[PDB]
Amino acid sequence: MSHQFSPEEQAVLRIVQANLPDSLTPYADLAEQAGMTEAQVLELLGRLKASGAIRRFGASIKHQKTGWTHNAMVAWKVTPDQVDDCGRKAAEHSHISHVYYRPSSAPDWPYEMYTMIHGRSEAECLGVVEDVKRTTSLKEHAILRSLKELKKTSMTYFT
Amino acid sequence: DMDSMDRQLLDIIQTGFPLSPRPYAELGQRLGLDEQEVLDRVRGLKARKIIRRLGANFQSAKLGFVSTLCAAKVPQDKMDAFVAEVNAKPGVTHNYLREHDYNIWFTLISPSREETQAILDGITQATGVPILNLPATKLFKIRVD
């Protein structure tokens, strides 16, 4: 972090990565806690918002069903000429949020295209898997059913 | 669960809580509310937990961090020690037991591809278990709510 941000700026970012101070005047509170002027606090956040480094400065809210219920990570074989078309045609499905291509040259892990599938039931999530086979050239796959969630944590970027 | 003023407020402050000296006043000006009522409302929505957090959300890549997905074939006899070494890492934010020969799958974020590999190499040296480092080179479309 010290190559991109002064110590005072990192002090700001450490506070805001959790919560804004709870007053009418949070940016003046940030300035007194960190080394700096309220105007410098606002320039710093303003700069990172503008650049995209801060994706959102604001309220994260509950509900809005973050995927009705029930997730499904499935990995598919795919040749280089198929990647972009399959990735695109796969991503078009309403129940598929995103598709990654993660190359692999492990002989016993030949799957490279990952479709993150959303559902209600088992056989819905697997129904989406049949949907992918009829609407893309993807065929061979491995369902990596989650058995146990071992860690679930948010990243701390400013320490 | 709340009034139309609260939905207007949230619509504003999920796009962006204002960067100005008196943010509640700016919001009050825009919503037709006095400054203190907008703070009162924010504080109530946080305490009813409809607002989970009010603060910054960062784009990792733009802060110079890289992310990957890791996978291993973990024998029953190494499971406990493996899982503990993996969960010990602050840059591991997801770790899952999954139904496949490759039965341990985790994400790992760090400042660089080299730091990430050194982390993975240390895990393997501690547990004797090799790990596949599987970074994404293409993403096809991503959404949240």
Residue numbers in the entry:
A (entry chain B): 1 to 159
B (entry chain A): 22 to 166
List passages from the publication reporting this PDB structure.
Here, sirohaem undergoes decarboxylation of the southern acetic acid side-chains, attached to C12 (ring C) and C18 (ring D) of the macrocycle, to give didecarboxysirohaem in a reaction catalysed by sirohaem decarboxylase, which is composed of two subunits called AhbA and AhbB. Both proteins consist of an N-terminal and a C-terminal domain joined by a linking region. The structure of the D. desulfuricans AhbA/B complex reveals that the enzyme shares the architecture of the AsnC/Lrp family of transcription factors.
To investigate this idea attempts were made at producing crystals with bound substrate, where native crystals were grown in an anaerobic chamber and soaked with sirohaem. The soaked crystals diffracted to 1.9 Å and contained additional density consistent with the presence of a tetrapyrrole. The electron density of the bound tetrapyrrole suggests the decarboxylations at C12 and C18 had occurred and the bound molecule is actually the product didecarboxysirohaem. The observation also indicates that the crystals are functional as a decarboxylase. Overall, little movement is observed upon substrate/product binding as there is only a r.m.s.d. of 0.3 Å between native and product bound complexes for the 296 equivalent Cα atoms. These side-chains help to position didecarboxysirohaem with the methyl group of ring C (C12) within range of Arg102 (AhbB). Mutation of Arg102B to an alanine residue formed an inactive AhbA/B complex.
